[PDB]
Design a protein around this ligand. Structure first.
Ligand code: FDA
Ligand code: FDA
Lengths: 432, 432
């Protein structure tokens, strides 16, 4: 006789999915969200007359869980201008910006990536079972930089792949675990063209917040915002959940979906397992941020890499026209390379990359400074993928989810949805 | 004031999915199935001590809808012996069986398939929108044989690819539409290795029937078997459904999921649209059947193609050992090349392919003669993909689903699930 059958902590995609699964079973469901908004590491907002995505943005039909949701709710794709590019730039660590023929640019990043992931088929024949092969466990002793060193890439190819990999690590690539990258490549059909198409080409029709809201409406769950959970205690055959103002909610089962790097806000009684405590002490790697920039000039359809010692590591066109000018979408690997909330620094760096432009405005999100993410997309350090099961394991009546805990597209919205479907299955098992 | 909110006609994957979607919304849901069993064009059975799948069998994590279901219900994959093959055979139209080095066999089918589908990226950048490009519509005037003629393949490669394509057509390849094949290739990550991995490598843990049952149990729907629908009439703002014994059930909405080739059993009032009537008169192409064969000898891990003038077009090992012998899984493109229910003919043909073996038993399913399939997997003839929307369109309070009506993996379980998710969404729209 608890207040609720299940309490879901966190209202990003993992928690919204889990609440939808539980609510459709008829369970009395409550979702507690710490921020005063839903979406978590996705955030739909508005800027220079456009809808923008300040966190997770792009999806793909090769991503099975989010795609099945878009099928269920009737959401199409919205194509960003990634094809027929006008300008493809590389900014080297030394600050030189070089314009490359788009054809040659794409050929060289494809060569670099296919070399980096040359053994993906043999190491990850089953990418949703990351430790299926012994070779995957053996490679979890290496970083991505360790492998890049052995490819003997050209200078352009080295700069491109190290930019790409620093972005995916949200860190320098000497800290970035290698098997996680090979696994993502395998999820994308074991080929560079398919994989790249999944990463920054198609957005969700109606936005990430539209899909979140659809699932939560569907769910019937009670949703409370601005309510951080600070303690969880297993007692009386269920759980007591304490919020920051010391109120207590009881439940038969709790689904945790908060980001790994935020677990320090929450006291567990009894303590979690040693393997989980080790993951919580380590956290996940990424220190990224995101920024949109409105410039007066029409730069057309552009793509730019910047290597890891520079701040504007992944640049794409979000919109362009003679009338509007250009909106640039810019993902920053390491918030320590640039204060995305310092407009003067941002204009300096944008002009470094595109000399001549005048900056009409910016919209930024510092995911690393936000207390309820404390980092960006999930990025595993060396040796962490090998221990993933420690983070996935249930502990009594507490179920764990979130993209960090997924097997497949762990750096994506899809991995969050996957973990939420798993969580709902586990709740059903616990309430049988 | 109808008997039910929605009646789902058909208990294969499309109907079970649609009923699950409707039941979880709380709609009063009934499913009518014509056979005395569920599963439709999947059928889990038993043979020589093993569980076998006499219809749809293999699935993949690149197939988004069925994979999301497996995630929801906790179903793993079961690997059949497709790697590290002992024997790879090609049987030519002239009846010669030739054993090919497995490495060479695989390289040659890969070359043939990558040439056949060379423009898949450009024609099907968005495989779930099959008519997105003008080139796709233009190509829908050509058959697969038209393209094979222009590739100038070697004799081995031509025989391999024509066997593969006759199987997918369930017909000779001069009748097989080309764009549907390019689209399937695109769904599979635009590359042969990924694509081939999706088609006959992994089975559903617990069987197709286990997933069907999980969805229907979840649904809460009322399920009736051995009850064929023979007429549907839209009247009084809903629908009157008549069964073969002239009983009448009323509903707000009906979801049709029966195979295209069986629509001749059902009278619609008012008549369906001309575009639908044209599809129903044409039907879909496939005339296939399936057979398992138990032989005394241990043949190990085998794969064989037979070209379209021969009957045992796709052969794989389902199980092998010295103790038990071998179980061969055999898919037949055209039931007119062999009477799979004629054990003597079956033994003759198996021995033609593997001379010397003793045939201990068989289990077969003639999908083409069965009145509630009248064919096997969905296979489009020339010009049909272009008109797919005619088949997909709702007609008043009648919703249409089934694998033939899906946009993506139309020849698969996945396409059926996809269409059932679409149907649930459309029912929700109609009942608002
Ligand atoms: C800048 C950037 C860019 C990208 C991406 C991320 C980011 C940050 N990703 C990844 C994607 O955004 C991410 O994997 C998912 O949104 C994670 O969803 P979860 O639900 O796991 O965590 P998420 O962090 O969304 O949800 C956790 C929730 O818990 C809440 N919370 C934390 N502590 C709490 C407490 N104590 N009590 C209560 N609530 C608490 C938080 O407020 C948050 O709402 C991405 N993906 C993709 O598919 N495509 C892309 O292009 C990108 N790009
Ligand atoms: C031999 C063989 C082999 C394969 C495959 C098929 C076959 C036949 N496929 C394809 C796959 O099996 C298929 O696409 C789906 O099962 C189709 O599901 P649907 O629900 O669309 O039709 P399905 O035909 O399953 O369901 C329709 C239902 O309607 C019923 N019905 C018909 N008329 C009726 C009436 N008047 N009233 C009531 N009910 C009526 C039928 O009895 C049937 O149950 C496959 N796929 C895959 O993913 N992997 C594979 O390996 C294969 N291989």
């Amino acid at each position: 006789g608890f207040d609720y059958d299940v309490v879901v902590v966190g209202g990003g995609f993992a928690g919204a999915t889990a609440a939808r699964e539980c609510g459709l079973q008829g369970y009395r469901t409550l979702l507690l969200e710490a921020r005063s908004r839903l979406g978590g590491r996705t955030f739909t907002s508005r800027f220079a007359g456009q809808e923008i995505e300040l966190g997770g943005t792009w999806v793909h039909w090769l991503q099975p869980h989010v795609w099945a949701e878009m099928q269920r709710y009737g959401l199409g794709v919205v194509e960003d201008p990634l094809t027929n590019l006008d300008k493809t730039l590389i900014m080297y660590n030394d600050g030189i910006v070089e314009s490359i023929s788009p054809d040659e640019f794409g050929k060289n990043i494809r060569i670099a990536f296919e070399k980096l992931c040359h053994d993906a088929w043999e190491v990850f024949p089953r990418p949703h079972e990351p430790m299926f092969t012994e070779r995957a466990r053996e490679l979890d002793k290496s970083s991505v930089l360790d492998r890049i060193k052995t490819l003997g890439l050209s200078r352009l190819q080295q700069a491109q792949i190290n930019s790409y990999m620093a972005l995916y690590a949200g860190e320098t690539t000497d800290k970035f675990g290698l098997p996680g990258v090979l696994k993502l490549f395998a999820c994308g059909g074991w080929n560079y063209d398919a994989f790249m198409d999944t990463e920054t080409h198609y957005r969700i029709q109606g936005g990430t917040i539209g899909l979140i809201n659809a699932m939560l409406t569907d769910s019937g769950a009670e949703v409370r915002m601005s309510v951080p959970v600070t303690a969880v205690e297993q007692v009386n055959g269920g759980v007591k959940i304490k919020t920051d103002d010391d109120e207590i909610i009881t439940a038969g089962v709790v689904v945790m979906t908060v980001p790994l790097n935020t677990y320090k806000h929450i006291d567990f009684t009894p303590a979690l397992s040693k393997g989980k405590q080790r993951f919580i002490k380590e956290g996940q790697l990424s220190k990224g941020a995101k920024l949109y920039v409105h410039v007066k000039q029409n730069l057309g359809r552009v793509f730019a890499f910047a290597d890891e010692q520079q701040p504007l590591n992944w640049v794409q066109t979000r919109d362009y026209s003679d009338e509007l000018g250009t909106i640039l979408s810019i993902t920053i690997a390491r918030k320590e390379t640039i204060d995305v909330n310092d407009r003067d620094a941002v204009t300096r760096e944008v002009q470094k990359m595109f000399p001549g432009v005048e900056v009409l405005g910016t919209a930024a999100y510092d995911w690393t400074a936000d207390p309820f993410s404390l980092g960006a997309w999930a990025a595993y350090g060396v040796g962490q993928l090998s221990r993933l099961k420690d983070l996935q394991a249930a502990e009594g009546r507490i179920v764990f989810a979130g993209a960090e805990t997924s097997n497949g597209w762990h750096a994506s919205i899809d991995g969050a949805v996957e973990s939420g479907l798993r969580a709902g299955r586990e709740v059903k098992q616990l309430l049988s």
